[PDB]
Short mmCIF file of C-alpha atoms and ligand atoms in Angstrom, two decimals:
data_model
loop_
_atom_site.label_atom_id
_atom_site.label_comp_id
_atom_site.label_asym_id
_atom_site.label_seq_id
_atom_site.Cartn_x
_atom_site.Cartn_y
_atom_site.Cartn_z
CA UNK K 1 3.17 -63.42 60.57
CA UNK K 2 -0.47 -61.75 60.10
CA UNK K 3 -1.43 -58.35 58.86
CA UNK K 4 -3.73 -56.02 60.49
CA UNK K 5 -6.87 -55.74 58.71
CA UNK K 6 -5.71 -51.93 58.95
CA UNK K 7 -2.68 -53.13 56.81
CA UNK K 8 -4.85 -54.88 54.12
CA UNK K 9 -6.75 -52.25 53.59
CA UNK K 10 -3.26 -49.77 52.70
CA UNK K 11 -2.28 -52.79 50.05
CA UNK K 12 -5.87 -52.96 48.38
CA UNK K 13 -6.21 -49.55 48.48
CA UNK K 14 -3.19 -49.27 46.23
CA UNK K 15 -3.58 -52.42 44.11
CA UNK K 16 -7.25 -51.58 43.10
CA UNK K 17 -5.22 -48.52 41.17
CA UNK K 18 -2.88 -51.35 39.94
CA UNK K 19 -5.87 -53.11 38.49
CA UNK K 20 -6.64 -49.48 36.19
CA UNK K 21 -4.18 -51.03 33.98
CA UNK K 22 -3.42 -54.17 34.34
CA UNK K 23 -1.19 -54.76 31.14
CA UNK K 24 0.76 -51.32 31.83
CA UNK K 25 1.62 -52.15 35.05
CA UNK K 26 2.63 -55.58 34.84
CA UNK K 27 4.78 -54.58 31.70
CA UNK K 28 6.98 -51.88 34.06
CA UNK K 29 7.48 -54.50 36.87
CA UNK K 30 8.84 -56.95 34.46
CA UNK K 31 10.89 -54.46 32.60
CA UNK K 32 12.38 -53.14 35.91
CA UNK K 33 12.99 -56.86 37.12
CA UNK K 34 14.91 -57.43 33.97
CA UNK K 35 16.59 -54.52 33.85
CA UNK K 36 17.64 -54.28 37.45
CA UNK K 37 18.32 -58.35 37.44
CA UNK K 38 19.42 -59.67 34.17
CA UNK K 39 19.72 -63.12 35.50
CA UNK K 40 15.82 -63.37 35.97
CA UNK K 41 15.70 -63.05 32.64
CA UNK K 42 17.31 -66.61 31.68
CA UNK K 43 14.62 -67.63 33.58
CA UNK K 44 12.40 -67.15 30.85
CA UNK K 45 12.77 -69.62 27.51
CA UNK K 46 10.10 -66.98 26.11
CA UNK K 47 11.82 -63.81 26.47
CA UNK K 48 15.69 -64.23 26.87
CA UNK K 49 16.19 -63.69 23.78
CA UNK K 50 15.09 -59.87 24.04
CA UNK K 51 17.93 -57.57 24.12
CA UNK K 52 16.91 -54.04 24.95
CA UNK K 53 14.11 -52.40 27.15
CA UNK K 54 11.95 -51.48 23.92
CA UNK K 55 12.05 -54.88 22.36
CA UNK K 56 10.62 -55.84 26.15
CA UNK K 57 7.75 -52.66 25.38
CA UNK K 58 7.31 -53.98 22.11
CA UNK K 59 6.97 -57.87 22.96
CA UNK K 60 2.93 -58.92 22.55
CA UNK K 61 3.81 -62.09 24.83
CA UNK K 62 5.66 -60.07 27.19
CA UNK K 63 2.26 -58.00 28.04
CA UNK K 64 -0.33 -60.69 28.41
CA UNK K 65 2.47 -62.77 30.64
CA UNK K 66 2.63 -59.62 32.84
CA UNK K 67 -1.19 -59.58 33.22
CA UNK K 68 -1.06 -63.19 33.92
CA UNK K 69 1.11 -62.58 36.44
CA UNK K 70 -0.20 -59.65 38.18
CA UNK K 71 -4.46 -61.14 38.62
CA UNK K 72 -2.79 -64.27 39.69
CA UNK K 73 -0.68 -61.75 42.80
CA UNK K 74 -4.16 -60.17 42.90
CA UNK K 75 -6.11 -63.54 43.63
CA UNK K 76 -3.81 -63.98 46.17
CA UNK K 77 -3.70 -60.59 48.22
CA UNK K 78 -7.78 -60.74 48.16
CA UNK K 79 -7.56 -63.51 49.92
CA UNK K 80 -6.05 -61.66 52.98
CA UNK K 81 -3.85 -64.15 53.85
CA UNK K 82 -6.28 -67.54 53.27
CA UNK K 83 -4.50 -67.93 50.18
CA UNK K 84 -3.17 -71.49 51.17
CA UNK K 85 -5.29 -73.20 48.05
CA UNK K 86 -4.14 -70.25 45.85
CA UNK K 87 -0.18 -71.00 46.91
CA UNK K 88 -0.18 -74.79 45.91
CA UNK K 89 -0.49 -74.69 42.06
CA UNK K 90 2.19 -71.67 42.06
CA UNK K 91 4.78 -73.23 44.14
CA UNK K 92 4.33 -76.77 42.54
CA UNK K 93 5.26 -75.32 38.84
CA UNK K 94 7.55 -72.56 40.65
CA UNK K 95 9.56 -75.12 42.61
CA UNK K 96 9.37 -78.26 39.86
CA UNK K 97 8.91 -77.17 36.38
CA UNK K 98 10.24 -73.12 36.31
CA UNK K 99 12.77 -73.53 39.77
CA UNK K 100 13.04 -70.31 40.93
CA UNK K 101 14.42 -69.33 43.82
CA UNK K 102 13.20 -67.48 46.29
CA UNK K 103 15.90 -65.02 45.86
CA UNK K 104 14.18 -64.31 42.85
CA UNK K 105 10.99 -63.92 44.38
CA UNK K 106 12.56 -60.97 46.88
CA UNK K 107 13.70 -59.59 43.01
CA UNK K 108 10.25 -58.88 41.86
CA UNK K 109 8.84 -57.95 45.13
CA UNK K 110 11.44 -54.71 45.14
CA UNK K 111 10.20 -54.17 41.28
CA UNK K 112 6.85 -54.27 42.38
CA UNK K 113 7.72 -51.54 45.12
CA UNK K 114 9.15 -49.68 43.34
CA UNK K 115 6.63 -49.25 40.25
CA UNK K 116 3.81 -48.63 42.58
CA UNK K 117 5.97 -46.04 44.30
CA UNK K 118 6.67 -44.25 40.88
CA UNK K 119 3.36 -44.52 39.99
CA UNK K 120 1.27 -44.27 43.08
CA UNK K 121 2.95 -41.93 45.57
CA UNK K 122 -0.10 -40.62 46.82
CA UNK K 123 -1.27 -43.64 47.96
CA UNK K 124 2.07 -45.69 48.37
CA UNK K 125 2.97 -43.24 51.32
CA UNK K 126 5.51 -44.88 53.69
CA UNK K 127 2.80 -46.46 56.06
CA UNK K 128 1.05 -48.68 52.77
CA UNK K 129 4.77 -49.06 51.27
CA UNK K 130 5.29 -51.14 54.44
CA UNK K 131 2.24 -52.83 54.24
CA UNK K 132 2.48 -53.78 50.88
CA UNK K 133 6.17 -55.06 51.84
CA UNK K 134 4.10 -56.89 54.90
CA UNK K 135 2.23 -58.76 52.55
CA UNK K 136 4.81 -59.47 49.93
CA UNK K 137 6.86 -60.63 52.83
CA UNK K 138 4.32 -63.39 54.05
CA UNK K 139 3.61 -64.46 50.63
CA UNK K 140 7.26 -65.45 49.94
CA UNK K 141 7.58 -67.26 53.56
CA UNK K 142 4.39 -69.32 53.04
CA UNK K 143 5.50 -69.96 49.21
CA UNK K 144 9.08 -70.71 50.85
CA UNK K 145 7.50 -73.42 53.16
CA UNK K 146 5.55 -74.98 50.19
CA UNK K 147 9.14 -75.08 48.30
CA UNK K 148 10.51 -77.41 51.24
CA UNK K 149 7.37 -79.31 51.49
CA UNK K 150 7.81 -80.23 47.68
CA UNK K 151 11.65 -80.79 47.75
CA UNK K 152 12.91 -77.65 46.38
CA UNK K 153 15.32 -76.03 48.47
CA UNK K 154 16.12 -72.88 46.04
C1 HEM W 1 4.88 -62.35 42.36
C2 HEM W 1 5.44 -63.67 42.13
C3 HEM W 1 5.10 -64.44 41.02
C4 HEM W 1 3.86 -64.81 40.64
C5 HEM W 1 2.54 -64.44 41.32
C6 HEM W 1 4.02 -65.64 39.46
C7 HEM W 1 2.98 -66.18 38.74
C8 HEM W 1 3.11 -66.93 37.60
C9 HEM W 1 1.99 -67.49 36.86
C10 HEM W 1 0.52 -67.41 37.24
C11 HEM W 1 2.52 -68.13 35.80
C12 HEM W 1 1.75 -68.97 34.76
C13 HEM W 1 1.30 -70.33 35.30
C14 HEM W 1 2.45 -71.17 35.87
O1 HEM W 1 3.39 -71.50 35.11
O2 HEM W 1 2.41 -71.49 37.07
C15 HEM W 1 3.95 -67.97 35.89
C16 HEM W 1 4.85 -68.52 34.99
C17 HEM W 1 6.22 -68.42 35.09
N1 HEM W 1 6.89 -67.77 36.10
FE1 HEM W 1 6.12 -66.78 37.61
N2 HEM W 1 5.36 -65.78 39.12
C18 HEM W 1 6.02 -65.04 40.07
C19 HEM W 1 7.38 -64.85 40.09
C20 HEM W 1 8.28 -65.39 39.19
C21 HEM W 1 9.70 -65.11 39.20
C22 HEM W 1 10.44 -64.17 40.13
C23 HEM W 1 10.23 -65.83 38.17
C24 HEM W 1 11.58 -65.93 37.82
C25 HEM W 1 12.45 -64.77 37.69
C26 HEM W 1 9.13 -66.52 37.54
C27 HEM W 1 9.26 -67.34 36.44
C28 HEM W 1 8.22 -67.92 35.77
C29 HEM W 1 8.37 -68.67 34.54
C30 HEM W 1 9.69 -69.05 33.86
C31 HEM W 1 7.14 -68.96 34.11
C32 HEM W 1 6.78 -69.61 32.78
C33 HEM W 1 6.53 -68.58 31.69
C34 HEM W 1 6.21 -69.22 30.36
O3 HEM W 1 7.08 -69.91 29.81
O4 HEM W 1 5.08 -69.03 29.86
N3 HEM W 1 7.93 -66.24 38.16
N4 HEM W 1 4.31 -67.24 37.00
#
């Protein structure tokens, strides 16, 4: 699948208000992935331990993992879609060391969603909503592929 440039444009548009705040934002997506899917959580040797959604506020590591997370998604979108050298590293330690699944990966896309749609509703009408899902969409099928590629069928 390709976007539109048209379509880029809606997700950046929306993500350069992500990257206001960083920290904040990554810390709802991960609380709302948590909350909304528990089992992510046992993912996580570093956090399964926390119990309630303001331990997860509270938690130092928590915050600078979410702003890991969120400039390495960043990297990515920027890319438009040439993000094949951007993909390897984060399905090699997705797929070997962490194994996730992509089921997972669908779970934090809909957190992602639905922060920026709490947060940004003026500029996550429907038409960049489905953009954004666009994009999310073709970054879990090309991450998908690499998971095959590498022998990881989750
Ligand atoms: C938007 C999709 C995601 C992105 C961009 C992403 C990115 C990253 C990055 C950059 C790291 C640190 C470097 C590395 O270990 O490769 C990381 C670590 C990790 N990710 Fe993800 N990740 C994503 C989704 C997920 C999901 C859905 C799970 C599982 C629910 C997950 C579980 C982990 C784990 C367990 C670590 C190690 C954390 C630690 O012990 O420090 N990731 N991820």
């Amino acid at each position: 699948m390709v976007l539109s440039e048209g379509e880029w444009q809606l997700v950046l548009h929306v993500w350069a208000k992500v990257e206001a705040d960083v920290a904040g934002h990554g810390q709802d997506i991960f609380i709302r992935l948590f909350k909304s899917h528990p089992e992510t959580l046992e993912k996580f040797d570093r956090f399964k331990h926390l119990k309630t959604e303001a331990e997860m506020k509270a938690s130092e590591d928590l915050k600078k993992h979410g702003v890991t997370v969120l400039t390495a998604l960043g990297a990515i979108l920027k890319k438009k879609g040439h993000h094949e050298a951007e993909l390897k590293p984060l399905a090699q330690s997705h797929a070997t060391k962490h194994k996730i699944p992509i089921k997972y990966l669908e779970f934090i896309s809909e957190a992602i969603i639905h922060v920026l749609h709490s947060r940004h509703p003026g500029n996550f009408g429907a038409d960049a909503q489905g953009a954004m899902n666009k994009a999310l969409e073709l970054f879990r099928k090309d991450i998908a592929a690499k998971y095959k590629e590498l022998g990881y069928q989750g």
